[PDB]
Design a protein around this nucleic acid. Sequence first.
RNA 1: ACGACCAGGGCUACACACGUGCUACAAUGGCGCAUACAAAGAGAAGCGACCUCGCGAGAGCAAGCGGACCUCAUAAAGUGCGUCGUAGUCCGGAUUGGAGUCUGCAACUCGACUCCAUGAAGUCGGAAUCGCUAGUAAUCGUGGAUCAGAAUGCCACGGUG
Lengths: 107, 114, 104, 79
Amino acid sequence: PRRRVIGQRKILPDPKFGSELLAKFVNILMVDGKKSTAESIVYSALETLAQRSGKSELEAFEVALENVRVRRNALAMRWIVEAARKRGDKSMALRLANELSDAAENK
Amino acid sequence: ARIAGINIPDHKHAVIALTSIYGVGKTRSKAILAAAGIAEDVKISELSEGQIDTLRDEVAKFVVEGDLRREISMSIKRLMDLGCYRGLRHRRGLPVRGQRTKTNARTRKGPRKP
Amino acid sequence: SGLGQHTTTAARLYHFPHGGDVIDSPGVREFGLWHLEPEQITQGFVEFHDYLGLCKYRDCKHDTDPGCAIREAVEEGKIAETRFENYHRILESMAQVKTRKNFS
Amino acid sequence: RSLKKGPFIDLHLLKKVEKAVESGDKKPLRTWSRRSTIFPNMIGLTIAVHNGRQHVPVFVTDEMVGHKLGEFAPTRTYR
RNA sequence: ACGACCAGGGCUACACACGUGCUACAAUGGCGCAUACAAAGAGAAGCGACCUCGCGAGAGCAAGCGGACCUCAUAAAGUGCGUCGUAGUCCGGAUUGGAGUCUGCAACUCGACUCCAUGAAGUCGGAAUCGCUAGUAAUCGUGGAUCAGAAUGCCACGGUG
Ligand SMILES: Nc1nc2c(ncn2[C@@H]2O[C@H](COP(=O)(O)OP(=O)(O)NP(=O)(O)O)[C@@H](O)[C@H]2O)c(=O)[nH]1
Ligand SMILES: [Mg+2]
Ligand SMILES: [Mg+2]
Ligand SMILES: [Mg+2]
Ligand SMILES: [Zn+2]
């Protein structure tokens, strides 16, 4: 970093929606290299956000992303995941869905 | 519902509620429900009194009560009153079956004090 | 004016009228604590022997650590606070004497 | 611990039991077999069990049957 | 005799201190059923299938194979369904008792493993301190050396990432 000035890696996007930004979101929640169990929680959390908390699933995540703002998007997604773990609900898909609901209404 | 195991099981599933009796784990609770004919996911609700007393008879083969406390205790009293080496381990609160006593003996020794 | 002078030399030997000897000392303002570890500083005080092993952690600096039972004994009043504040002055002196190096 | 096909006992100590039954009880018998399984024909005898430097006599009791002679002799002195 | 032989004991002790690890404190999980995908090695005083018995550790019977053939050897995470619903719990497994397997002249001091039962502390850890810039970190299992037997250590190997 003192001499070695290089860029940052560009991972493959979301296979479901074609979103580059959502591919970085599932990697933060992913622990122990478990991609298969991480993306199932994120997909089920957004479907709760889409069907019962407002349409335009890709736009509904962006409104929740906008209030908590490369590094600006990185710190915003990290604050959602880490605050979702310390909640009172039952599952990780239910906790992160309520965090995106609160971030959409900036509270 | 009061069993011969007088301590009242919690109002939950059958294989979990039988575990609260001293001397019935997870495996033995499965053996009683298999011998009686009651499913393991049946709660205390709808478990009729004709289905509770048939669990009293199946558990009656095993002594699982404060009477089981004294039988474990007097088995240790057989060791300590005899004067054996293993009986000396129980009287001071030291590990018996080969655990070291340099460090990491906190369960047997009790909390630390210099 | 407000100080003391060390006129008499190192040590002169005499005898008691009953028995034993006397040894005079110089006027000394020196503190050599290069001997051993700060674990031995904990052993250098009498009443602090009986209060070891009572704090939260097994290792403790006893100044900025939460739950120090030795600090609770000073706050209770069984240990005077003059001795406690001077105790960490000994520990902060070892942050100032040790600086260059010295070894025997 | 040990398998059920035959409880182990040393041959020299088994000979010491047989003469003790016929000729009656004697002075406490010094031995080194800390690994022998106690049989019911030994009840009443006093066997001196070696523990590293000395021999400690052990009066055999009825409920000692099945145990080892090494379970009655501490090998270290603690203070 | 500072030599040598043998028996037993000690190297594994216990009021404590320190460094190094494993498993945890859990719903990104626990358990039950169903089920998919590895690479790299080891094997003749050895690996030991199939069949049969035991809840199980295993045992009996008994081939194949000095081996790209046969055996260890069904990889585990994952996937699908059901369950528990945030608690000292169907978390976590310590400790202890009882009943046993196998190794070996011989498992008390001091072995491994299975079964039943018991269910400590612990609900994410102060000052301080370490590793790591990519198939890396993290995590999942497998194999080997040592070895009659005795791996949370070490050496390798892949899976996901
Ligand atoms: N008023 C009074 N003066 C005293 C007393 N004891 C000593 N002094 C005085 O104090 C002074 C110092 O005494 P001194 O014994 O020489 O001190 P020191 O510690 O030996 N000095 P040094 O360090 O040179 O050896 C002397 O002038 C002495 O007379 C006392 O009880 N009362
Ligand atoms: Mg029970
Ligand atoms: Mg558990
Ligand atoms: Mg580098
Ligand atoms: Zn303290």
